[PDB]
Design a protein around this ligand. Structure first.
Ligand SMILES: Nc1nc2c(ncn2[C@@H]2O[C@H](COP(=O)(O)OP(=O)(O)NP(=O)(O)O)[C@@H](O)[C@H]2O)c(=O)[nH]1
Ligand SMILES: [Mg+2]
Length: 162
């Protein structure tokens, strides 16, 4: 079946793994468990198309080049209560542009942890960035499962259109 090679990238602690497990295992991981490299396979039906999501959950901590090269779509994740993570987005996208040799790659900017009240990054600020990159912006919470399916599915739709 049509495979989709998705890669979740972002700074440490922004909730990359949490967004992934909530999609596959349908539950929120409220524990300290830093990722080295984990891969998930799932048969799903998206817009009536039987496809398989081959998702690679990356570490937040030269070595990235390997999986960025084989990835088709990318979830660019930052935490809305962490300005540093939002700023680190630019570095990640730059390295993806470098290893892909492309200015336009299927990509979605995710603003995670939107359930928290201690926001430090305004949604307008992130939206302006997403506009500048030419990609969609979506706010999510792995805790309440808000926007989770929205984030991953939209990414698939961007690949289909690429
Ligand atoms: N309130 C809230 N907390 C969240 C959310 N998503 C993740 N967290 C939490 O924030 C922490 C970090 O989660 P984790 O998914 O491991 O982040 P990560 O970016 O994969 N870490 P790394 O890249 O280092 O392995 C956890 O303690 C976790 O439950 C969220 O959406 N809302
Ligand atoms: Mg992780």
């Amino acid at each position: 079946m049509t495979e989709y090679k998705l890669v979740v990238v972002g700074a440490g602690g922004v909730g990359k793994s949490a967004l992934t497990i909530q999609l596959i295992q349908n539950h929120f991981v409220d524990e300290y468990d830093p990722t080295i490299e984990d891969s998930y396979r799932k048969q799903v039906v998206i817009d009536g198309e039987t496809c398989l999501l081959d998702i690679l959950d990356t570490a937040g901590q030269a070595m990235r080049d390997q999986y960025m090269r084989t990835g088709e779509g990318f979830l660019c994740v930052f935490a809305i209560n962490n300005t540093k993570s939002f700023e680190d987005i630019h570095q990640y996208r730059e390295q993806i542009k470098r290893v892909k040799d492309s200015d336009d790659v299927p990509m979605v900017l995710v603003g995670n942890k939107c359930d928290l009240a201690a926001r430090t990054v305004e949604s307008r600020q992130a939206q302006d960035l997403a506009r500048s990159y030419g990609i969609p912006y979506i706010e999510t919470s792995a805790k309440t499962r808000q926007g989770v399916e929205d984030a991953f599915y939209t990414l698939v739709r961007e690949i289909r259109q690429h």
